[model samples]
Target: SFDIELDIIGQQPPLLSIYTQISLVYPVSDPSQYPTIVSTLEEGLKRLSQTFPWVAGQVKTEGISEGNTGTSKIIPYEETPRLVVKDLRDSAPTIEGLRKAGFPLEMFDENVVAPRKTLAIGPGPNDPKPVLLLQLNFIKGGLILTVNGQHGAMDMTGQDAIIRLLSKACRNESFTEEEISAMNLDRKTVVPLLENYKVGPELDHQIAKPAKATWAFFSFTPKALSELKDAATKTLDASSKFVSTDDALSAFIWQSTSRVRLARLDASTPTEFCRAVDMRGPMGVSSTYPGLLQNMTYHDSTVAEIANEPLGATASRLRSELNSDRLRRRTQALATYMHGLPDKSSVSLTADANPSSSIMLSSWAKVGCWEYDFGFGLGKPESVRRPRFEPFESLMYFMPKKPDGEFTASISLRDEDMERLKADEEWTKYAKYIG
Candidate 1:
């Protein structure tokens, strides 16, 4: 299906307009079932879209020159959004071929199986794109499903729910009336509900494949993450500000990654960290409610400050800084402001994102991307990963554990910095290079 002739529009959104892409590799104990699995999943995806209807839609909009705060709306395609199926058995390695060649499922190589990078449709787009694009790739012993959605359509939470529903579809399972309700696409009521929210200074700060940078994937055992947390908590004084696994892991990355940068650049340079968080729980919203409810929490520090501070200190701050009231206000404020704003040019973010000196963190943490059992005797996917976006830089992702159990993380950085990062004693203590 990909003659290397595919791309996506709608940058991250009004949920109706922006989207990003991701790929998941599902392993089959019986490779011969490829034909059945393909038809089954394709049909499953079709049924799933039929219910949502809008999932098969595209973003239509007045020109940006219209000077509106996101004049975007989703238009359903008359044709069903079908799954694009492709064969990579010959172009890529089979499960056995890969293991025999040295790379095992434990250290899956995305380059070997991930779909070709989807091109960006450039800014100020008019062509409408379906909110969802799924490609089912048949390898010798596994299948890869590439899901592309406007980033704003749903954060990881909603995306997971969609995938879970997809599993249900494959079994010809019935969807509840509530599951098929009109509640999912009610964008109009959101801003009206936010009319009372007072926007705050900002609950946040705010990427693409970065040229001159390369990415590395590493894994941490449950013990590894816990020990990292222990080490940080071991040094804490005031318990008012608790340190979480997220804080400890990210803080440690902040420290270690910065340690290398300081060694390589000037020590006095500044650095920033942005934590991408799901706001559903904090905002007192239902877990079932979906759409753009994600936000970023930002922290600023000098390379020298965080790089040398006790990991506990940074982690404590990381956890404590998440003031829910302030965040609620920020969200409300953003909604109110964006609703009446004259144009998109005045849009602002509290977090000063200087990409050259900042690290943006995303996590599957407890998002449950790894927890679904998508039938076919497939259990869960062997791995779920996003294809690289070169325009995104200094990006870090904390993936949840697989059923087999393990948390994997990946980040992009300068080549030489990754060289030292690989050998850094503190980093290696908890992280093991898997690829």
Candidate 2:
């Protein structure tokens, strides 16, 4: 019930107009402890708002300019970015029941994860919209913490930091000035980069709307990952560049997806694989620098190329394409592309290519999903779950799994393609379905 307005002092990057949502579920054996858990979270959010003032703020247009276009910044107002509590014990399936049913309890389900009703889109003057929404859903056996934040406000890295800070506050700990400063999205750090570059027409594309799809989850044990590395390596000569676990996996996915597409549609269609590379270090930016700072890198291969190439060669090719120099070049290119745009409204990071012809991959394996311990000893979340959002039909997420060294591939594809993927003998040879 605690409410307050927190002032944030920074402008968001142009690309942050999108929103990012994450959910974490923790087990609780006793229903009697709900009140304490609720109070602690409520207090923790108040403290979090104070620590990260931008969470409760809204992006607003500042100064009068020609027409409706004007410079804008996030302005924090009272009683926003609020926390919502929902009791789902009687209305929906509980986490415990999901686990018992062997329904892949770790994946996000809209019935379990909380939702954000209102979000700010672009620059405007209106009631301060909630930049961050923290929802606590109580089920029969556990609690789910769903966090929805404006991507223009923060990136996954920044969101990760906020989760860590909120956990500390729930335990009644104070954050160091160094920690606070690291999360700052001050305009000085971002504006210069924008001013030096501009957006171009090449950055604009008509993204095909995704069709009906079915989602599947696959787990790769440490042993399986090692075996994949070996298989991928065996395909290359000694002069081949080294391939990491991620490289092998990406190659496998791209090849497998290409195969599925060939079976479902045109055999000669080209397949492109795209992934976001972290540019913090390559661009001389601190890991702690807040908001989205990633560069997208992609490779296109024909179905024949994918099917004919050795796994090791494919992995090496992808690895070689993602290096420090390439990231720097892309960063400068993207910045310059955005800089040329008439206004932020015209900014579009999405690809206009057909979804069936491309696969977008994002890795959350390093995010340490199990690290959030919200002051509840054993009651804290054992793991985290990220649900599938709309529009991106052909996408894959590599998430951390239990027993360490294990990773989960949460994949989405068209119905027939998903069936083909599941039936693919090569895929079954390496991946095991846990749910």
Candidate 3:
């Protein structure tokens, strides 16, 4: 855990990149669980320190700013940890409490939360802004966990570990040193492809650009999701069919959101959903050592420009687009191209017309499903409540699959678009519900 502070050369303000993680609510049959939650969290940290002593050590660097000005900077390489206890035994938890708990922006604030172009504008490297965000709220019989991180520090896998630790802390027992050591050992196993595929200094500029689509979230029950799967299977042959869980869900969501938004606007406008794909393991690569690495890839696809195309057609188009290798290759090409750039700061990936016009579709359903099993007890389950920054209206989060294998989609949308969908018959049926 080295403390790194870089100086900036351009107009980009320094950004505070923080990753926030919210969990599904944990049922509290007993108020005594509160103390357990607190104690368990502490124990989890203790074990974490024992497993990775480096986290407790200090590592900060200065004078690395872009312009070698004599002005020096100071940064702390410390683990700032906390366990927030909230009682949402009554109504669903509001985003206000989360804001109070160190989350920077408001839940629905359009300014900070909106997706911006990562390439052309905003924070520079050395700026000391808050980057990562984590919020855990308890609602009626459930928990919501949200994590926001600087695109640089840790990727999805690192965020996944945070959630995993939280879940484990809520367990009924403490992990033995040996058990903790074994889990930590996995970090040592190196996957070379991950190393070679590391995001070089060049690609940093490309990821800085903001996204372009609007977003809203919806959840489906296990039975409803199963029915959806069956419907999709009946519609497409095995060859052209949707396969992976994320693929099927992504297609369903694209169709659902499009139906609602298009009907309201009465005009056919092309929309794109950018899905962040984490490429750590299956590619035979490893970055689990807890260092900065670029293993996540985002691919954008347009939907529903033809006014006559029904929901089914949109779904079909999504299926075809996702199945084809074009999307991945485009992302790969971008990565390859970035790798060849001279000054990383010169590259830009922002769209011509709209920077916030894109939607971000992220899947963390599987990541949240794993059991943390801390020695003292289990951490509370939670989910993302809402954005505290800007209101880009195009962000979406996919929860981990339930024990029954069903997942939920949380979307952020413009209120007018939501109302229009609620009033339509076909659109309402297509969308599980508008938020």
Candidate 4:
């Protein structure tokens, strides 16, 4: 009776259509253990389905009479899927192979990814798509639990739930009754519609214009974060606007990365720092609502302005921009803005008004991604990574840190810009290229 709508019909919404993927790597002790590993993961999916049956249904589109829905008159969401298992022990990248090749287990190689072109159910343009697809791949000395889901049906919050629950299910753990309830709530209802709020200001950033951008991960160890926070705090005035470690770290990244851009662009060229602010607590939306609840927050400044400002001041500006009043209004306006778009399928959250001039960071911290134990007999996963990225864009995921204490900024940039970022002296100070 509930829905989390991203306005898809006939085909998945283009922006939300990116086949979301998560590859959890587990060590395989022997070739004999492959089938058992596959059994365990698929069985976990089956168990999870008892509570989330909609997952197994194919995503379909149907029109409501009179197209009653305001903007997204054509609602597209039917759920169903079967896990596809491929025993590629002979050809797939092995755990040891990845290690020998100097790649982290959590980070899969480009060769391991699956594109969406072949994922639709048939060759026709209007064919339906599987709501969820888990490709349980068995590789030498490894088991890669690749979970791909329809992004329009659920965002990372939902996918994260899908992964963790599958882990608990495999371990013979049961979900709380409330957990089941949270999963059933619709996305449309979780967030209030375009109404009853403050006079909304115009959005600072534009829809991100689409990026062979080089994707890389940089580690900011806890110590590095602490020092950066301290440095930023010391520079602030007594008005006492609080800032988190994320703010400080992001500021450093923004400043560091902008230096590379400034070298090429004009001194006063406009630039923006944009990020998706989580909408749970602030909007009174359920944290456990297994769907997207987010809106972008933009910080507008010139290339020179951001570069010339003190790191503390920049972080402070970032903090102030999150003012409860402004944020609440913006969250409500997101739906309003999207509803006004002529083509719902064309909606994208990444681009700013000025294309290719903004850095977008979406925080994935505190999602407990590192805490899932998939009962692989190998304990916790060596790492968690999204193998596929939105192509050629300056996008960054503030990934949850591994247990070992290093937070990761998994980022993408234009190939040439990425090279320049790597060679920049100031940008390298607190960050090390890592998974």
User: Which regions in candidate 1 have their CA more than 4 angstroms from the true location?
Assistant: 1-18, 29-31, 66-70, 97-124, 177-185, 191-200, 203-211, 237-241, 346-351
lDDT of each: 0.64, 0.66, 0.44, 0.65
Write model 1 residue lDDT over 379-429, tens digit each, in one string.
676666655554345777876556655677778776777788898998898
Model 4 lDDT vs. the true structure? 0.65
TM-score of 1: 0.85
List the candidates' TM-scores in order: 0.85, 0.85, 0.63, 0.85
- Candidate 3 or 2, higher TM-score: 2
How would you encode candidate 2's per-residue C-alpha lDDT over 202-292 as one tens digit per residue?
3443122257786667888899899999998888645655788988998888888887778766667777777756666787766666555
Q: Write the per-residue lDDT of candidate 4 for residues 27-49, one digit (tens) a residue.
A: 77787776667677767777877
Evaluate residue 293 in candidate 3 and report its C-alpha lDDT on the 0 to 100 scale: 25
Ranked candidates (lDDT, high to low) = 2, 4, 1, 3
User: lDDT tens digits, residues 1-435, model 3?
Assistant: 333332111111222223333433344444565556556656665555454444333222233445422212223333533334444445243544543442222233322232322222355333433333333334443334344434333445555654465445445345556445433433223222122454554344244543232444455666665666666555664356454556656667666556666654434455655565554433233333232222223333443552244434444554554432443444454444433333344433332223333456667665643344343233433333334333446567776665666565666667665565457665445445423
**Per-candidate total of colliding backbone pairs:** 18, 13, 103, 19
